[PDB]
Amino acid sequence: LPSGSDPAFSQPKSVLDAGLTCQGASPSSVSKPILLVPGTGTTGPQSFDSNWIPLSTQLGYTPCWISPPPFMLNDTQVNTEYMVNAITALYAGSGNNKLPVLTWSQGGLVAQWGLTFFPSIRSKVDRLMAFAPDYKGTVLAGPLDALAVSAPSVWQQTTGSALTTALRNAGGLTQIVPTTNLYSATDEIVQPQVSNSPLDSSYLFNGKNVQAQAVCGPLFVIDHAGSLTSQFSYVVGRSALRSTTGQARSADYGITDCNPLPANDLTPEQKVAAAALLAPAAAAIVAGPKQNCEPDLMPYARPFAVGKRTCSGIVT
Amino acid sequence: LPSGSDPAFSQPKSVLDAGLTCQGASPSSVSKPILLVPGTGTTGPQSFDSNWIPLSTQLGYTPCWISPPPFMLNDTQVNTEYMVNAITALYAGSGNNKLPVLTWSQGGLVAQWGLTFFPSIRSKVDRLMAFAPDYKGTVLAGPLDALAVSAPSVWQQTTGSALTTALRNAGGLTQIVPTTNLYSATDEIVQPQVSNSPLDSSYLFNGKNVQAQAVCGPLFVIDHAGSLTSQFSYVVGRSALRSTTGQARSADYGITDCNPLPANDLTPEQKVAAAALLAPAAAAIVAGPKQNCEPDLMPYARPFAVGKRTCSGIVT
Ligand SMILES: *[C@@H]1O[C@H](CO)[C@@H](O[C@@H]2O[C@H](CO)[C@@H](O)[C@H](O)[C@H]2NC(C)=O)[C@H](O)[C@H]1NC(C)=O
Ligand SMILES: *[C@@H]1O[C@H](CO)[C@@H](O[C@@H]2O[C@H](CO)[C@@H](O)[C@H](O)[C@H]2NC(C)=O)[C@H](O)[C@H]1NC(C)=O
Ligand SMILES: [K+]
Ligand SMILES: [K+]
Ligand SMILES: [K+]
Ligand SMILES: [K+]
Ligand code: NA
Ligand code: NA
Ligand code: NA
Ligand code: NA
Ligand code: NA
């Protein structure tokens, strides 16, 4: 696991700060922040307005989020700069108090990439609650890559990519801070997820790895978006957020919570938007960037993916 | 459309027969046969053991398949002899009753080549259910082969080929029996498929042409193999097989069926095998025969591709 200096950011501070917002507050002076990191094809509000922005507010946090442009479709490594900058800011802005990070989809990969390569944030994040994280990527992006209809970050989120290779070889498939990963065998976006084991894309060694079918039964069905928005997900997320260990606890949820529909505390109208969470993501992918190769690794990550091929050639 | 005698077989009938197998039945005495025609780089079992063999069984059919050697890599015109012989056999063996044909990839090109050039089988095929058929071939020169260093049937499936030209000029891009074509914009092997129109390689005039994204949305992703194996594909195929019209019916499927993962009725082990369909087929193509020209058209097809080039020169 890297333990030296932080890499320098490629983006200026003005740019990174512009991508961070808090509800009703400035990052420079915020009470009990939670940092929300969005999924592929979305802004922070698009991922979370119908779900964890109001739910976290009801738990007493001030939700804050990043929106790396365009819609989380550019280089995951740059998406991570937004996250690292935001944790630094929000920690300073809330009294040097550690804060939680809550993610969907790629946001969890971004969080873990940041924790792996930017040691400074490890003391600033108290826990990670990741919904449907793709730490191994997804095999399902393969045809899109072959067709050259994949955005930068979609290439990076393909199983076997240089990015996912680097994360693994740097030690990033082991939890770094207390981590809960909630995911589903029936996720239609991220696979493989079926095994309830380290083979799954969402699994981290020493983490609290919650495959919904383990709790709720193998026949249980909960999709990629539902993995973020469901009542089951709310109970698990609340467990993680409240737990003194920094991980969800099996005592905190069971069969009575195995409701895949949008969280009960959401208003009717929020439930409608939550259920429809993935539509705007699909439309952003559709209009968004597309290329025929995986973006290059930044220098700090190259040693961890020697021999993989990116846009510029083979990593040496 | 051609309307006379069937072309003579180039292969002995014993050889053709030996390539036909049914599950649990002789072709001479079979209950409700369905004939399965595999994709390039596979035998019948390799295409269908994880999918339409069990899925058709559960629908009450006896699955039967052909396995033209080696692995569907030889002349598509010879592959078609196996299909024509099998239809003749299974029609008689089911009491002189027409039977459905269900195909993947090249198998659909084979079925339509047979229906176009071998008139005797038209009255013996109840309906055709083709998954990812490449009636126009493909424009994508994939990464398996050096350009123009390819197997016989790979040449023939290249857009612009003499074979695909002949099919078109003989009238074979119009359905001959009731046909449903299920295909995907995100097919990484066969393109173009993106338009939901007669541009697409899988489209037949007067057919029931089902591009999955037209139903499911633009980021519904199923690949060339997923076109055969997905739950969405199963719902459409079941509709096609049951329909009184011989074609799938839009009433039978909709957004709720839009699951790209392997068909729900497959066991956990069959789903893993279905999701792994493509890689060993691609490896069989890589390991297979290579030549530097397209196989010659048989005499009965030449007049429909005059001016195209095969191994013996420009067709006359
Ligand atoms: C998208 O990611 C790329 C790649 O990391 C960013 O482009 C780099 O930006 C740095 C900072 O200016 C440059 O030094 C490199 O030359 C850039 N590389 C490439 C290939 O262009 C880019 O800034 C990111 N875009 C956004 C909107 O964040
Ligand atoms: C593969 O296809 C070629 C047709 O392209 C077949 O070869 C022909 O076989 C007939 C029947 O014996 C011969 O009369 C021809 O002279 C052959 N032509 C060529 C170019 O060799 C061949 O039999 C097929 N192989 C298999 C295993 O089916
Ligand atoms: K700001
Ligand atoms: K304040
Ligand atoms: K507790
Ligand atoms: K019709
Ligand atoms: Na399940
Ligand atoms: Na290039
Ligand atoms: Na094979
Ligand atoms: Na040719
Ligand atoms: Na099984």
Beta-carbon neighbour count of residue A251 at 10 Å? Answer: 8
In this structure, the residues whose C-beta lies within 6 A of any atom of ligand 1 are A 10, 69, 74-75, 78, 295
What's the domain count of chain B? 1
How far is the C-alpha of B92 from the C-alpha of B100, rounded, in Å?
A: 14
CA dist., res. A135 & res. B11, Å (int):
53
Nearest CA to A61 out of A8, A14, A121, A127 is that of: A127
B105 is catalytic: yes
Name residue B202's amino acid: S
β-strand partners of B138 = B158
Q: Which of A78, A73, A90, A76 is nearest to A36 (CA)?
A: A90
Q: In 3-state terms, what secondary structure has residue A169? A: helix
Q: Which residue has the tokens 């983490």?
A: A207
Compute the C-alpha angle B241/B243/B247, nearest 5°.
Answer: 75
The experimental technique used to determine this model is: X-ray
**Helix axes of A76-93 and A106-117: crossing angle, nearest 10 degrees:** 70
Q: Using the beta-carbon criterion (under 8 Å), do A147 and B186 form an inter-chain contact?
A: yes
Task: List, as one string, the DSSP characters of A9-50.
Answer: PSS-HHHHHHTEEETTBBTTB-SSEEEEEPPTT--HHHHHTT
* Resolution given for this structure, in angstroms: 0.9
C-alpha B6/C-alpha B88 separation (Å) is 12
- Nearest residue to B129 via CA among B21, B252, B217: B252
Compute the distance between CA of residue B113 and CA of residue A170 in angstroms, rounded to an integer: 54
Identify the DSSP state of A6: P
Q: Which of A139, A194, A282 sits opposite B218 (nearest CB)?
A: A282
Phi, psi at residue B87, to the nearest 5°? -60, -45
Beta strands in chain A (DSSP E): 20-22, 33-37, 62-66, 99-104, 125-131, 179-183, 208-211, 309-310, 313-314
Binding-site residues, ligand 2, Cβ < 6 A? B 10, 69, 74-75, 78, 295
| Cβ count within 10 A of residue A245 | 11
Strands B62-66 and A99-104: unpaired
Provide the CATH number for the domain around residue B122: 3.40.50.1820
Which atom of ligand 1 is nearest the CA belonging to A69?
27
Residues of chain A found within 8 Å of residue B268, distances taken between Cβ atoms: 194, 218
Query: Residue A245 Cα, ligand 5 centroid: separation in angstroms?
Result: 10
B37, B20 contact by CB (below 8 A): no
Burial label, B124 (beta-carbon count in 10 A; 0-12, 13-18, 19+): buried
Among A36, A252, A264, smallest CA distance to A131 is for A36
The CA distance from A311 to A95, in Å, is 43
Owning domain of residue A130: 1-316
Closest CA to B309 of B162, B175, B106, B159: B162
- Six token digits for residue B311: 């191994």
- The secondary structure of residue A60, as a DSSP letter, is T
Partner-chain residue, chosen from A188, A218, A283, that has the shortest CB–CB distance to B259: A188
The helix (run of H) or strand (run of E) holding residue A166 is: helix A162-169
* A143 → closest Cβ in B143, B186, B271: B186
Full DSSP string of chain B: ---SPPPPPSS-HHHHHHTEEETTBBTTB-SSEEEEEPPTT--HHHHHTTTHHHHHHHTT-EEEEE--TTTT-S-HHHHHHHHHHHHHHHHHHTTS--EEEEEETHHHHHHHHHHHH-GGGGGGEEEEEEES--TT-B----SSS-TT-B-HHHHHTBTT-HHHHHHHHTTTTB-SS-EEEEE-TT-SSS----SSSTTSTT--BTSEEEEHHHHH-TT----TTHHHHBHHHHHHHHHHHH-TTSS--GGG--GGG---SB-TTS-HHHHHHHHTSHHHHHHHHHHS--BSSPPPPPTTTGGGSTT-EETTEE--
Question: What is the identity of the amino acid at B186?
Answer: T
Task: Give, as one character, the DSSP assignment of residue A205.
Answer: B
Q: Closest Cα to atom 5, ligand 2: which residue?
A: B75
Q: Which atom of ligand 1 is nearest to the CA of A298?
A: 5
Cβ atoms of B301 and B169 closer than 8 Å: no
Query: Nearest CA of chain B to the CA of A112: how many Å?
Result: 26
Q: What share of chain A is helix, strand, coil (3-state, %, to 5)?
A: 40, 15, 45
Contacts of B263 in chain A (CB under 8 A): none
Q: Determine the Cα–Cα distance for residues B292 and B74; give it in Å rounded to an integer.
A: 14
Mapped onto helix, strand or coil, the DSSP state of residue A167 is helix
CB atoms within 10 A of CB A201: 25
Best residue among B75, B85, B113 to mutate for probing ligand 2's pocket (most ligand atoms within 8 Å of CB) is B75
- Could you tell me if A216 and A232 are in contact, meaning their C-beta atoms sit under 8 angstroms apart? yes
**Chain A residues with CB within 8 Å of chain B CB:** 139-140, 142-144, 146-147, 149, 186, 188, 191, 194, 218, 278-279, 281-283, 285-286
